[PDB]
């Protein structure tokens, strides 16, 4: 069912995350972490304290898809287990902000072609697939985008609901 999902998304905030490559999404999926640039880190920290759920929706650039979405489970922190992000040549690990712990809500992909009817009011109502890294997606668009993903039957949102 979608009911616990809808509960987790109730009054969530949603942020488009752009990964340069699949390796970093796969590391995020395996490690339950994400790191972003300071400008997005501060937005996500602000959002994490402001909303019951902060949902990161991941898209690998040039993939034409979203690769799933995750709920922030912490603010960003530094010093932890280092993550060997395959970073775009031009960026160093120091350029990144701290590390967010995330709980994956959906590890399945969704092709952009399936979200072509969703516009993001916070990006001039451009298709929700369109957005810079860190782009916040308004609640209704964000919720409908997440409900478009194939259900991820490997995930039990029971523990996620407990965190919120
Ligand atoms: C982990 C990562 N985050 C980004 O915001 C860009 C590239 C790699």
Swiss-Prot record:
**Result of mutating residue 34 to D?**
Abolishes RNA-binding and ability to influence alternative splice site selection
Q: What is this protein called?
A: YTH domain-containing protein 1
Q: What does this protein do?
A: Regulator of alternative splicing that specifically recognizes and binds N6-methyladenosine (m6A)-containing RNAs. M6A is a modification present at internal sites of mRNAs and some non-coding RNAs and plays a role in the efficiency of mRNA splicing, processing and stability. Acts as a key regulator of exon-inclusion or exon-skipping during alternative splicing via interaction with mRNA splicing factors SRSF3 and SRSF10.
Subunit structure of this chain's protein: Interacts with SRSF1. Interacts with SRSF2. Interacts with SRSF3. Interacts with SRSF7. Interacts with SRSF10. Interacts with CPSF6. Interacts with KHDRBS1/SAM68. Interacts with TRA2B. Interacts with KHDRBS3. Interacts with EMD. Interacts with RBMX. Interacts with ZCCHC8.
User: How does the record comment on the protein's domains?
Assistant: The YTH domain mediates RNA-binding.
Q: Where in the cell is it found?
A: Nucleus; Nucleus speckle
Result, substituting residue 132 to D: Does not affect ability to influence alternative splice site selection
Impact of altering residue 24 to D? Abolished binding to N6-methyladenosine (m6A)-containing RNAs
Outcome recorded upon mutating residue 18 to L: Does not affect ability to influence alternative splice site selection
Its taxonomic placement starts with:
Eukaryota, Metazoa, Chordata, Craniata, Vertebrata
The reported effect of residue 66 to D is: Abolishes RNA-binding and ability to influence alternative splice site selection
The record lists RNA as bound by 18-20, 34-35, 85, 133
Which domain of life does the UniProt lineage start with?
Eukaryota
**What does the record say mutating residue 132 to A does?**
Reduced binding affinity for N6-methyladenosine (m6A)-containing RNAs by 100-fold
For this chain, the Swiss-Prot or TrEMBL PTM comment says: Tyrosine phosphorylated.
Residues covered by the YTH domain: 12-149
Q: What is the effect of changing residue 85 to A?
A: Abolishes binding to N6-methyladenosine (m6A)-containing RNAs. Abolishes binding to m6A-containing mRNAs
Q: What is known to happen upon mutating residue 104 to D?
A: Does not affect ability to influence alternative splice site selection
Q: Which residues carry this modification: Phosphoserine?
A: 81, 92
Where is the secretion signal located? Answer: none
């Amino acid at each position: 069912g979608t009911s616990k999902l809808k509960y987790v998304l109730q009054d969530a905030r949603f942020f488009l995350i752009k990964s340069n490559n699949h390796e970093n999404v796969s590391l995020a999926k395996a490690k339950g972490v994400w790191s972003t640039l300071p400008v997005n880190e501060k937005k996500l920290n602000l959002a994490f304290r402001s909303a019951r759920s902060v949902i990161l929706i991941f898209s690998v650039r040039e993939s034409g898809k979203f690769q799933g979405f995750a709920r922030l489970s912490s603010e960003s922190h530094h010093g932890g287990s280092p993550i060997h992000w395959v970073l775009p040549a031009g960026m160093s690990a120091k350029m990144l902000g701290g590390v967010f712990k995330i709980d994956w809500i959906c590890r399945r992909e969704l092709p952009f072609t399936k979200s072509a009817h969703l516009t993001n009011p916070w990006n001039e109502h451009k298709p929700v697939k369109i957005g810079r890294d860190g782009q916040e997606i308004e609640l209704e668009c964000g919720t409908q985008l997440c409900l478009l993903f194939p259900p991820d039957e490997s995930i039990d949102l029971y523990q996620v609901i407990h965190k919120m």
